Amino acid sequence: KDENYVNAIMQLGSIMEHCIKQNNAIDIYEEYSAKTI
Amino acid sequence: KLSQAAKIMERMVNQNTYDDIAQDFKYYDDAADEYRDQVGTLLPLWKFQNDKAKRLSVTALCWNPKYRDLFAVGYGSYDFMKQSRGMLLLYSLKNPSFPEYMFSSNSGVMCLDIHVDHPYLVAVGHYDGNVAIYNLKKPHSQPSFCSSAKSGKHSDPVWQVKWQKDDMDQNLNFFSVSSDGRIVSWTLVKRKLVHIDVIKLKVEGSTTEVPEGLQLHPVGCGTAFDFHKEIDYMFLVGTEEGKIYKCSKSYSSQFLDTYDAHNMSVDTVSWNPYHTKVFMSCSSDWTVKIWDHTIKTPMFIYDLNSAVGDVAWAPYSSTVFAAVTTDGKAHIFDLAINKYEAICNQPVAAKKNRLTHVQFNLIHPIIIVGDDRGHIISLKLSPNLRKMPQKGPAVEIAKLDKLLNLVREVKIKT
Amino acid sequence: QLIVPHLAKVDEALQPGLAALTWTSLNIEAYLENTFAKIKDLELLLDRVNDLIEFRIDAILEEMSSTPLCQLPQEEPLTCEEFLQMTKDLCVNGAQ
Amino acid sequence: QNMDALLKVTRNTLEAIRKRIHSSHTINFRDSNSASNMKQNSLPIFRASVTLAIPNIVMAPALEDVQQTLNKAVECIISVPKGVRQWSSELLSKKK
Amino acid sequence: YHMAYLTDAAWSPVRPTVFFTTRMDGTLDIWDFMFEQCDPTLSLKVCDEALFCLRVQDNGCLIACGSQLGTTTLLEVSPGLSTLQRNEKNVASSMFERETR
Amino acid sequence: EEFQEMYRLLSGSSSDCLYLQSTDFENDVSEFNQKVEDLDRRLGTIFIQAFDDAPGLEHAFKLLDIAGNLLERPLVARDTSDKYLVLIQMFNKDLD
Amino acid sequence: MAEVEETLKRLQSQKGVQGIIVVNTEGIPIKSTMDNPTTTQYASLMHSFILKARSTVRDIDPQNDLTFLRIRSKKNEIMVAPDKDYFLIVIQNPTE
Amino acid sequence: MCDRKAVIKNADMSEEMQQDSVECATQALEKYNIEKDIAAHIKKEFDKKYNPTWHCIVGRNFGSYVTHETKHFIYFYLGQVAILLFKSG
Amino acid sequence: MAEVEETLKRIQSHKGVIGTMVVNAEGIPIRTTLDNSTTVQYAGLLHHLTMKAKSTVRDIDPQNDLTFLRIRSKKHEIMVAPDKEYLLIVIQNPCE
């Protein structure tokens, strides 16, 4: 119910929504004759 | 013992240089298009450049068929007396700062293509007539296969190479065209690059007997060729003389049809990805001509007043294509909107700078323009440039058929 | 060092075309076949000599170089009576 | 090449003997803490028995016999190139 | 029709499509009629004298060639010429029937 | 099975394929003669590729007799005229 | 080896990368391009952290294992992967 | 009955009461989640069965230095929860 | 609250995200997308890993603070977002 819960979720959720797509668009685990004897 | 770790961070040092800016262009061009009626804009995205190819011309561009962010760039020298080495570089949108894979060739790279089934194999032709097959899985800079004089090669520069379906023995196949008039099918059998001469180009009407008894028959220099989407044997040859030879794979001696396309060198001939009958031609004649394969006459004529380096069909709809010219201007046309003028014409480079090649990303709405000094620029099409109207390829076929029939009704009456 | 008599014949094969012969000359084809045949005989000389040195002299020298004169066991500690086989039997057989 | 290869035979034989004799007292410490009684990680070259002969403790067989027999092995290793006939060298070191 | 008489031959015991041939010019011709039909896959200048006898080891890897001088050359062919390809017998069965037909 | 389906459509047609009426000569023979010549140049292209695949004199003449009774047509005669001279050229090479 | 050092030089030449240190599992740096005291406290303090990061992850899941760790501070992100007996640190400023 | 394998690391008794420690820790893990009561249930069962004084340590990350009577100490892993039971008193 | 949950359902609705929860700057969950026992173990361990990441930031330089934390393991990736009083920790599988 405290107001500091609201703006923290908005600030970090902007980081989450930006950086979850960073985990999604880039896959970290993506691994790219006959001689004389 | 750090090979696993260093490979992880090398791929993934390129995160904040991708997705701080990949989701940027997803919603960066949503501006000023509700106020502009029918004219689009090209949005300046990132610039790709390497120091090893500063004085070399971008001569071929091809997106990876599997990856929406990886593309391969080849570097050559269109200047005939300033020939030099040729670079093969692959850039990812994840790493705009540094290319993902570096390759080098002795002769100037003038053509490349990526296999659709095997995105790790690229066939690259050069100025000396050698075609080479590079493997991306191998970290070595050498191609897996490479033609030579003993294995068969062109005596003239290779201008286009295109991958093809596997042959009658299930071996990888690709075709090449060159200035020696030889269209050669190259087959990937085990560890060899076998060459098969399919079509030898000859010029008609100029077989003159010099008055002591020898006939040097004229050999039409080949510049551009593309295969038909549905018909397997159908393909076209864009020639130096301004002619388009409609040809078949099974007829090595007779062309199916000949179109007097242009009057200087036809740089690019490509088929429509939706309509099976529509192909297009561009040349240095400053005119951009659209054709049907059943009709001799060009359906559309677009004089761009500058030498059109390259054209490419867009794969989201069949009525829009792009053209780049030597004056630095990129031209966007839409036949359903403007049958006579470009809907967008923005100078993406300087007047001194000559544009060479252009292509579209398959999924993301961003284009790439090549250059004669090695520059690569990414550009997102505006929502005006990707405006959508039922869905399907037959819808795009019927949309272009109405445009075809109307211009057919134009030429019947007018 | 040993092929300078035959390389003199190879040096006898090349010199008329480099200096005396010209491009307008009509005896090029005879010079072409004479140079080709003498080069072809040089091809037969080179491949036989390469086979008799890269393998034959080198591997047999390598085979005897890799022979250990003391077959040291790791299953039983050597004693006074055990070490006599190392001194006499396999040492002589290795020498043979 | 033949002297060099033959020297590789003697130098590999003598290094193999020298490495095998050079073994630490506690070289079996990697297995367990009671390595004094168990066999070593690399097997000990010699085995002897310790007994009393008043007023002395004598180990059997004699340690001087171990050194002499090892030297006799070295002498017969040294005797191996004596039985090998040499070719294509006039003088290497046989005075003036 | 070769320029020299053919003196001995031996099929590959592991490859139905591979046979080896000898001439009097010391030429061992490696044939494989899925790759090339009218020409040998590999041609070797084994010696400068006339080969007379030819034998192949049962694994198909080692090849002995006897000459006019009483010498024998042991040749280790490539894994592409000594290993059975997938359904190589089925390739051979079809064209042998086709050419017989 | 695809060939079975297309003939079943002709067999199952309400109107007979053997329907013969006035002026039908100009109706279909001009289309029929077009298909004969198109098959002739397709079979002629097959023979030319097989003639390049013919490795000898007797087998080319057998292949000539395999594709007989059609080379008298002028269009395929022009196509095969050069390969007859090729057959002339390697009869020389067999004589040499 | 050659690919490992080439990647290290490539990572150092990457845009915004400030640091590269190779440390074993005890906290002792092995390969570094910078001054030692900043290298040493980079090595020791996060070796305490990688002993806590791997323990916390494995507390959550016994069969899991730590593969990578990102510590994004106000200046940069500590960008580091463990590998067998070592972990290689990349100190990269994403805004540089 | 959870299939938590009793990975025995150091068990200094006879084999019979090793299983009693395994079975009681299995009952303690099934009945309780807090490591207080898991260490309590093992100790109170062993105090009733094998006399005072026992001590039980239950946890996932601990390094323990304890002194124990002979034939009266086990240290083992039951699944992932580690149990240190030793007698001292 | 409506805008708070709208972002937090959007975070869960993003690709590969396994579970999202909010732990404070003390070690207790507030809301969760998982069960209570798994989240509490996730809350106590990852917060104590978060301040240990914060501790690793400040002993490197006291003027620096942690702003974001990714913890990639063999199975998933733990994504901690530190704030003044809350930690927005998201479990996401990048392979999904």
Short mmCIF file of C-alpha atoms in Angstrom, two decimals, chain B residues 42-226:
data_model
loop_
_atom_site.label_atom_id
_atom_site.label_comp_id
_atom_site.label_asym_id
_atom_site.label_seq_id
_atom_site.Cartn_x
_atom_site.Cartn_y
_atom_site.Cartn_z
CA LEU B 42 14.15 6.18 -44.75
CA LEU B 43 15.13 6.19 -41.08
CA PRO B 44 18.90 6.36 -40.37
CA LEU B 45 19.88 3.22 -38.48
CA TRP B 46 23.38 1.96 -37.74
CA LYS B 47 26.40 2.07 -40.04
CA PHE B 48 28.55 -1.02 -40.63
CA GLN B 49 32.19 -0.57 -41.64
CA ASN B 50 35.56 -2.30 -41.34
CA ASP B 51 39.06 -0.87 -41.69
CA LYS B 52 40.23 -3.72 -43.97
CA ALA B 53 37.80 -2.75 -46.77
CA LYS B 54 37.82 1.05 -46.74
CA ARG B 55 38.92 1.36 -50.40
CA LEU B 56 36.83 -1.56 -51.70
CA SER B 57 33.35 -1.51 -53.21
CA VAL B 58 30.48 -3.43 -51.64
CA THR B 59 29.63 -5.80 -54.47
CA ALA B 60 27.17 -8.31 -52.97
CA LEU B 61 24.69 -8.40 -50.08
CA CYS B 62 22.64 -11.31 -48.74
CA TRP B 63 20.78 -11.77 -45.46
CA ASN B 64 21.10 -15.02 -43.57
CA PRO B 65 18.01 -17.15 -44.37
CA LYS B 66 17.77 -18.31 -40.73
CA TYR B 67 18.87 -15.24 -38.74
CA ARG B 68 16.99 -11.93 -38.82
CA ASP B 69 20.09 -10.06 -37.58
CA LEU B 70 23.03 -11.64 -39.46
CA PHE B 71 24.05 -10.70 -43.01
CA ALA B 72 27.07 -11.29 -45.24
CA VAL B 73 28.93 -8.50 -47.07
CA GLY B 74 31.41 -8.92 -49.92
CA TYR B 75 33.94 -6.33 -51.04
CA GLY B 76 35.44 -5.85 -54.49
CA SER B 77 36.64 -3.19 -56.93
CA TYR B 78 34.42 -2.10 -59.82
CA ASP B 79 37.33 0.00 -61.12
CA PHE B 80 38.92 -2.10 -63.86
CA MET B 81 42.48 -0.81 -63.37
CA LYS B 82 42.15 -0.49 -59.58
CA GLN B 83 41.53 -4.18 -58.89
CA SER B 84 42.67 -5.46 -55.51
CA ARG B 85 41.92 -8.06 -52.84
CA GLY B 86 38.40 -9.10 -51.88
CA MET B 87 36.89 -9.25 -48.40
CA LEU B 88 34.07 -11.49 -47.19
CA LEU B 89 32.62 -10.15 -43.94
CA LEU B 90 29.54 -11.07 -41.92
CA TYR B 91 27.89 -8.51 -39.66
CA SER B 92 25.30 -9.12 -36.97
CA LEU B 93 22.88 -6.54 -35.61
CA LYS B 94 24.05 -7.80 -32.21
CA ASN B 95 27.52 -6.38 -32.97
CA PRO B 96 27.31 -3.27 -35.17
CA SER B 97 30.77 -2.27 -33.90
CA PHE B 98 32.63 -5.43 -34.98
CA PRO B 99 31.80 -8.02 -37.66
CA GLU B 100 31.11 -11.56 -36.49
CA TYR B 101 33.21 -13.42 -39.08
CA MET B 102 36.14 -12.13 -41.14
CA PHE B 103 37.25 -13.76 -44.39
CA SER B 104 39.77 -12.72 -47.04
CA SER B 105 40.30 -13.54 -50.71
CA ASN B 106 43.16 -12.81 -53.11
CA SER B 107 40.86 -11.49 -55.85
CA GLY B 108 38.05 -8.96 -55.56
CA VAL B 109 34.82 -10.45 -54.22
CA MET B 110 31.99 -9.50 -56.58
CA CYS B 111 29.22 -11.99 -55.73
CA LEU B 112 27.97 -14.12 -52.85
CA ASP B 113 24.89 -16.10 -51.88
CA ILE B 114 23.86 -18.05 -48.77
CA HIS B 115 22.28 -21.49 -49.04
CA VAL B 116 18.72 -21.41 -47.71
CA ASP B 117 18.89 -24.93 -46.25
CA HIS B 118 22.50 -24.46 -45.04
CA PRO B 119 23.01 -20.90 -43.72
CA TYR B 120 26.61 -21.81 -42.77
CA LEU B 121 27.70 -22.20 -46.43
CA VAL B 122 28.32 -19.18 -48.67
CA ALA B 123 29.46 -19.44 -52.30
CA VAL B 124 31.70 -16.51 -53.28
CA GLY B 125 32.98 -15.59 -56.74
CA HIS B 126 35.84 -13.22 -57.53
CA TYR B 127 37.39 -11.04 -60.25
CA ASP B 128 39.83 -13.76 -61.34
CA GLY B 129 37.02 -16.20 -62.16
CA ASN B 130 37.33 -18.33 -59.02
CA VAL B 131 34.24 -19.39 -57.09
CA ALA B 132 34.82 -20.34 -53.45
CA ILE B 133 32.61 -21.97 -50.82
CA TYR B 134 33.15 -20.72 -47.27
CA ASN B 135 32.01 -22.60 -44.16
CA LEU B 136 30.88 -20.47 -41.22
CA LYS B 137 31.10 -23.37 -38.74
CA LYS B 138 34.83 -23.61 -39.44
CA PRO B 139 36.59 -20.65 -37.73
CA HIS B 140 39.32 -20.75 -40.40
CA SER B 141 39.37 -18.01 -43.03
CA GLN B 142 39.84 -20.47 -45.91
CA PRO B 143 36.88 -21.65 -48.01
CA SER B 144 35.89 -25.30 -47.77
CA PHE B 145 35.73 -25.54 -51.57
CA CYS B 146 37.36 -23.35 -54.20
CA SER B 147 37.53 -23.56 -57.97
CA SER B 148 40.80 -23.28 -59.88
CA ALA B 149 42.21 -23.64 -63.38
CA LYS B 150 42.54 -27.42 -62.99
CA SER B 151 39.09 -27.83 -61.40
CA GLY B 152 37.42 -25.46 -63.88
CA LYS B 153 36.99 -21.71 -63.55
CA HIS B 154 35.99 -18.60 -65.45
CA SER B 155 38.58 -16.67 -67.46
CA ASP B 156 36.53 -13.51 -66.78
CA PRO B 157 35.13 -11.94 -63.58
CA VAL B 158 32.21 -13.66 -61.87
CA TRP B 159 29.39 -11.17 -61.32
CA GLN B 160 26.59 -13.27 -59.78
CA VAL B 161 26.45 -16.59 -57.95
CA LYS B 162 23.16 -18.09 -56.76
CA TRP B 163 22.50 -21.21 -54.72
CA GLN B 164 20.25 -23.90 -56.16
CA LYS B 165 18.48 -27.10 -55.13
CA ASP B 166 20.55 -30.29 -54.97
CA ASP B 167 21.15 -32.12 -58.24
CA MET B 168 20.13 -35.62 -59.38
CA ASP B 169 22.64 -37.23 -56.96
CA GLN B 170 21.68 -35.16 -53.85
CA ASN B 171 24.77 -32.92 -53.94
CA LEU B 172 24.68 -29.18 -53.26
CA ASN B 173 24.46 -27.11 -56.43
CA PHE B 174 24.88 -23.45 -57.32
CA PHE B 175 25.12 -21.51 -60.57
CA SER B 176 27.46 -18.72 -61.63
CA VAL B 177 27.54 -16.18 -64.45
CA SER B 178 30.60 -14.33 -65.72
CA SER B 179 31.82 -12.05 -68.49
CA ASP B 180 33.03 -15.05 -70.55
CA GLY B 181 29.41 -15.90 -71.37
CA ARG B 182 29.52 -19.20 -69.46
CA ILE B 183 26.71 -20.10 -67.07
CA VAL B 184 28.23 -22.91 -65.01
CA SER B 185 26.50 -25.25 -62.57
CA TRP B 186 28.85 -26.00 -59.67
CA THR B 187 28.21 -29.22 -57.75
CA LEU B 188 29.41 -30.02 -54.22
CA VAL B 189 30.47 -33.67 -54.45
CA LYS B 190 32.48 -34.81 -51.39
CA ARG B 191 35.50 -32.48 -51.41
CA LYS B 192 35.44 -31.30 -55.04
CA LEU B 193 33.92 -28.35 -56.90
CA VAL B 194 32.84 -29.95 -60.18
CA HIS B 195 31.92 -27.57 -63.01
CA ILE B 196 29.29 -28.17 -65.70
CA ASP B 197 28.90 -25.70 -68.58
CA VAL B 198 25.15 -25.15 -68.95
CA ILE B 199 24.69 -22.21 -71.34
CA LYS B 200 27.31 -20.48 -73.50
CA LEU B 201 26.22 -16.93 -74.31
CA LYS B 202 26.57 -15.76 -77.91
CA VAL B 203 25.56 -12.49 -79.57
CA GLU B 204 23.13 -12.76 -82.48
CA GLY B 205 23.32 -10.69 -85.64
CA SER B 206 27.05 -9.89 -85.38
CA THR B 207 28.64 -13.05 -86.82
CA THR B 208 30.71 -11.31 -89.49
CA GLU B 209 33.33 -13.10 -91.59
CA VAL B 210 36.62 -11.18 -91.47
CA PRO B 211 38.10 -11.48 -95.02
CA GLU B 212 40.83 -14.05 -94.42
CA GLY B 213 38.85 -16.87 -92.80
CA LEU B 214 38.36 -16.86 -89.04
CA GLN B 215 35.19 -16.29 -87.01
CA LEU B 216 35.75 -14.98 -83.52
CA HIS B 217 32.12 -15.41 -82.52
CA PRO B 218 30.97 -12.68 -80.10
CA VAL B 219 30.45 -13.88 -76.53
CA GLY B 220 27.84 -11.97 -74.56
CA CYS B 221 29.21 -10.92 -71.18
CA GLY B 222 26.95 -12.06 -68.35
CA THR B 223 26.17 -9.73 -65.45
CA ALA B 224 22.98 -10.81 -63.67
CA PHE B 225 20.82 -13.93 -63.49
CA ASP B 226 18.02 -15.15 -61.23
#
